[PDB]
A paper describes a structure:
Bqt4 interacts directly with a telomere protein Rap1 to tether telomeres to the NE. After extensive screening, we determined the structure of Bqt4NTD-Rap1BBM complex consisting of Sumo-fused Bqt48–140 and Rap1498–512 at 2.7Å resolution. There were two Bqt4NTD-Rap1BBM complexes in one asymmetric unit. Rap1BBM forms an α-helix and spans on top of the β-sheet composed of strands β1–β4 of Bqt4NTD. Notably, the loop between α3 and α4 was rearranged to form two new β strands (β5 and β6) upon Rap1BBM binding. The interaction between Bqt4NTD and Rap1BBM is mediated by a combination of hydrophobic and electrostatic interactions. Two hydrophobic residues of Rap1 (F503 and V507) form a hydrophobic core that fits snugly into a shallow groove formed by β1–β4 of Bqt4NTD. Rap1F503 is sandwiched between Bqt4F46 and Bqt4F61 by π-π stacking interactions. Rap1V507 makes intimate contacts with a hydrophobic pocket formed by M63, V108, I37, and F39 of Bqt4. Besides the hydrophobic contacts, the N-terminal half of Rap1BBM helix is rich in acidic residues, and sits on a basic patch of Bqt4NTD through electrostatic interactions.
Bqt4 is one of the most abundant INM proteins in fission yeast Schizosaccharomyces pombe, and plays crucial roles in chromosome-NE association by interacting with different protein partners. Here, we report the crystal structures of the N-terminal domain of Bqt4 in complexes with Bqt4-binding motifs from Rap1, Lem2, and Sad1. The Bqt4NTD comprises six α helices and six β strands arranged in a compact α/β fold. Overall, our data suggest that Bqt4NTD is a protein-interaction module that recognizes a consensus motif.
Residue numbers in the entry:
A (entry chain A): 11 to 212
B (entry chain B): 4 to 17
Write the structure that this text describes.
């Protein structure tokens, strides 16, 4: 038996389980005390997403080790974002400004193309020049090409509840201010890309 | 249809 600390950044709960019990018991223990479902969360240990069937003996967990609790995100992330520490500077000249004519007048956007490993159609990270708002939908679909519509609808519901959503029927998707866009970049491991999209000329 | 400018426009208004 060992003591384990589980924290979601706001609340820390300490547990005690034997090294042969599944960590789902410790996952359901923390999730129940947050008022959330176990599937609604994912747990990290040294940056490794813990699966339910794994045990403290399966990993090399010692006493007082911390298990980070985060909300669930799709499993297959875009291999382009396997490194959140890449220098953002060479990505800025790849950003392009583009004018789009709307029923109420033209508007300027800034686009950054990102390789989609699942489709031949080009995918772009988009930024509106007027308010520097960034589409959270284009960020999510870029980082998780194999995501289901339910997995997206739950994420956008989380954006509206925890961030500052901006939705307009004239422009598709869910849009967030630059501060929220850099927070999503941390979850999606897209920091160098969003950092360059915000610093690009409009 | 597959050019950057045209694909980006359809992506923001659909």
């Amino acid at each position: 038996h060992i003591n384990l600390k589980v924290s979601d950044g706001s609340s820390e709960i300490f547990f005690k389980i034997k090294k042969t019990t599944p960590l789902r018991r410790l996952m359901e223990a923390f999730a129940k005390r947050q008022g959330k479902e176990m599937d609604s969360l994912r747990f990290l240990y040294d940056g490794i997403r813990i699966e339910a069937d794994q045990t403290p003996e399966d990993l090399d967990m010692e006493d007082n080790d911390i298990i980070e609790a985060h909300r669930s995100l799709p499993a297959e992330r875009n291999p382009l974002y396997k490194d959140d520490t890449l220098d953002h500077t060479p990505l800025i000249p790849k950003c392009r400004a583009q004018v789009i004519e709307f029923p109420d007048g033209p508007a300027t956007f800034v686009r950054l193309k990102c390789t989609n490993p699942e489709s031949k159609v080009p995918h772009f990270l988009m930024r509106m020049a007027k308010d520097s708002s960034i589409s959270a939908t284009s960020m999510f679909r870029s980082a998780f090409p194999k995501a289901t519509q339910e997995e997206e609808d739950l994420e956008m519901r989380w954006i509206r509840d925890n961030l500052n959503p901006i939705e307009d029927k004239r422009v598709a998707g869910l849009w967030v201010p630059p501060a929220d866009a850099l927070a999503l970049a941390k979850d999606y491991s897209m920091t160098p890309f969003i950092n360059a999209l915000l610093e690009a000329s409009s | 249809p597959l050019d950057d400018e045209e694909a980006f426009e359809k992506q923001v208004t659909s």
